[PDB]
Design a protein around this nucleic acid. Structure first.
Ligand SMILES: [Mg+2]
Ligand SMILES: [Mg+2]
Ligand SMILES: [Mg+2]
Ligand SMILES: [Zn+2]
Lengths: 55, 122, 49, 124, 100, 69
RNA sequence: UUAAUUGGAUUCAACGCCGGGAACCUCACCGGGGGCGACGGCAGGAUGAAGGCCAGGCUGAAGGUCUUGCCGGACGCGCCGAG
């Protein structure tokens, strides 16, 4: 076929297996407790999720 | 098939029943143009209304339908012209075999013309 | 062009030179490899004659 | 002054199962063989066996740098990709147990020039 | 014959309101209740670099989410069990009921 | 024990040997020479006097004289 | 230096910094091989457009393409705008 020359392989580990669910970036993904967010995206949506800066 | 093949005459009634009763059939049925597509269907009996215009030359790929007419019931009629047959059912090109299955509200005329062709020449 | 020939069909008799695949019905035709029945879509390692 | 690998001549190595040979190689080769060969290595091995049988009178070119040299490959010449071109390698008996990539360098040797501006503190 | 009730929330007031409702239900009948036991709080702490780029001094944020818990044990009585099954929690409180 | 000798599974005989003095020196020399004959990567590294076990060389391993600009 | 050794930052306030511990991916660099044009219009097209394949060459490997002929029925990048 022809569309086979456009599909990516289904990776199970490595940096290529995880993307931010809000912007699609590869790299600095926060994996704690199942979050999948960049360090950039988490900073601006943290107050809505209920986190606070106590100290 | 082709005009240079004298099978029988050209009654007006057969053309009336064959060209003017597929526009009422297209809107409530499925269309299968083309000789090669229809050939397998008519060999397998999938063809129901085999309308054959005399526009295809040479006597190479037209020389299959008549010798296969005895192999099946093959209710078939002949079409005078190719220009508007596609306009009757399909697309605006020249078609030679518009075979359709289960047309809607075209039973009495089709049965009568099929009987007439059966008793006319086979 | 046009591809419908090589079939022995006479004025009244229709018989196919190339058999159809046993998987499917009549009408689908094989190739003419001559060493094996190519079949196009099924393929057979039979050493046809 | 013949060749021996663990007390075996070349011919005794030739008539060995891949499992029996795997007990003589170092641990890395043994684990690689036990875990099976990749499909690309399968195609390369098929070509090699064909060439040995007397067919395939064409040069062998391959992208497989991680293929392990085997005794039945001795005497052939293989062209291994180094990144930009295929280099010839002539397989000798003392190569048994090595990866092909070890014989096709991927970097050029460095011959230094004169240090330029900013190479020292005083040049900035 | 005794049922165990677990509660959890990010808001400390709603937890106490639901617990007080349960305590009133139990007192409103003749039934023994093992008092609301406070279990250790869950803290989720996440530390991140602030700047989008890599230039400048490195400074950090320390975000925190706190989850509070309670535990109540009470003997299963049909007259009182239906009442504690009819009480509906605010949307930010999780409640689970099991039979031991 | 066999796992205590300094040349187990000899490359030529296949046995477990322990070498001392000159024999040890010439065995090591022969191993390096074999690596050099087949033009293997480690043989080239041995010839050029550069690190063999995959070290970085931009910063450390400097033995020479400062060049002028 | 190299085929390439991808880029940003240069006093404090650049240099275990870009959460930068890169085997593949990441990837932006180098050598090579493939794929893609909603919507309008031109050629063309059921006398079958576009599209898909058993075997075998080409190839690092590939119906990618060629050889060998079989499958599918309605749109059309061979041309112009536009995306
Ligand atoms: Mg740089
Ligand atoms: Mg690493
Ligand atoms: Mg990489
Ligand atoms: Zn993000």
């Amino acid at each position: 076929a022809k569309a086979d020359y456009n599909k990516r392989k289904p990776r199970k580990f490595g940096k290529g297996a995880r993307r931010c669910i809000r912007c699609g970036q590869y790299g600095p993904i926060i994996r704690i407790h199942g979050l999948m967010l960049c360090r950039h995206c988490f900073r601006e949506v943290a107050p809505k999720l209920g986190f606070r800066k106590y100290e | 098939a082709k005009p240079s093949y004298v099978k029988f005459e050209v009654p007006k009634e057969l053309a009336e029943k064959a060209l003017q009763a597929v526009e009422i059939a297209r809107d409530t049925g499925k269309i299968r143009k083309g000789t090669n597509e229809t050939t397998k269907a008519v060999e397998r009996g999938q063809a129901k209304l085999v309308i054959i215009a005399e526009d295809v030359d040479p006597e190479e790929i037209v020389a299959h339908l008549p010798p296969l007419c005895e192999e099946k019931e093959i209710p078939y009629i002949y079409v005078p012209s190719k220009k508007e047959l596609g306009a009757a059912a399909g697309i605006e090109v020249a078609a030679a075999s518009v075979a359709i299955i289960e047309p809607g509200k075209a039973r009495d005329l089709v049965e009568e013309i099929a009987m007439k062709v059966r008793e006319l020449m086979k | 062009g046009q591809k419908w020939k090589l079939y022995i069909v006479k004025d009244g008799k229709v018989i196919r030179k190339n058999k159809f695949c046993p998987r499917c019905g009549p009408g689908v035709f094989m190739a003419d490899h001559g060493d094996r029945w190519a079949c196009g879509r099924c393929g057979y390692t039979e050493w046809k004659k | 002054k013949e060749f021996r690998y663990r007390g075996y001549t070349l011919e005794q190595l030739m008539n060995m199962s891949l499992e029996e040979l795997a007990k003589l190689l170092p641990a890395r080769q043994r684990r690689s063989l036990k875990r099976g060969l990749t499909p690309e290595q399968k195609k390369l091995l098929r070509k090699i066996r064909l060439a040995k049988k007397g067919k395939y009178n064409k040069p062998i070119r391959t992208h497989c740098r991680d293929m392990i040299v085997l005794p039945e490959m001795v005497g052939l010449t293989i062209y291994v990709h180094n990144g930009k071109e295929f280099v010839p390698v002539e397989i000798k008996p003392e190569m048994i147990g090595h990866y092909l990539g070890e014989f096709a360098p991927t970097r050029k040797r460095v011959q230094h020039g004169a240090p330029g501006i900013g190479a020292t503190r005083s040049s900035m | 014959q005794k049922a165990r009730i677990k509660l959890a929330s990010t808001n400390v007031r709603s937890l106490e309101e639901v617990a007080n409702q349960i305590k009133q239900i139990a007192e409103r009948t003749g039934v023994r209740m093992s008092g609301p036991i406070p279990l250790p709080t869950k803290r989720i702490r996440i530390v991140t670099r602030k700047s989008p780029d890599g230039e400048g001094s490195a400074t950090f944020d320390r975000w925190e989410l706190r989850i509070h818990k309670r535990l109540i044990d009470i003997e299963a009585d049909e007259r009182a069990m239906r009442q504690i099954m009819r009480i509906r929690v605010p949307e930010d409180v999780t409640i689970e009921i099991e039979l031991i | 024990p066999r796992w205590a000798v300094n040349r187990p599974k000899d490359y030529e005989t296949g046995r477990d040997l322990h070498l001392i003095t000159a024999k040890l020196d010439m065995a090591i020399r022969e191993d390096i020479m074999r690596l050099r004959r087949i033009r293997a990567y480690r043989g080239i590294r041995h010839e050029l006097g550069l690190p063999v076990r995959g070290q970085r060389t931009r910063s450390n391993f400097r033995r020479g004289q400062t060049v002028g600009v």
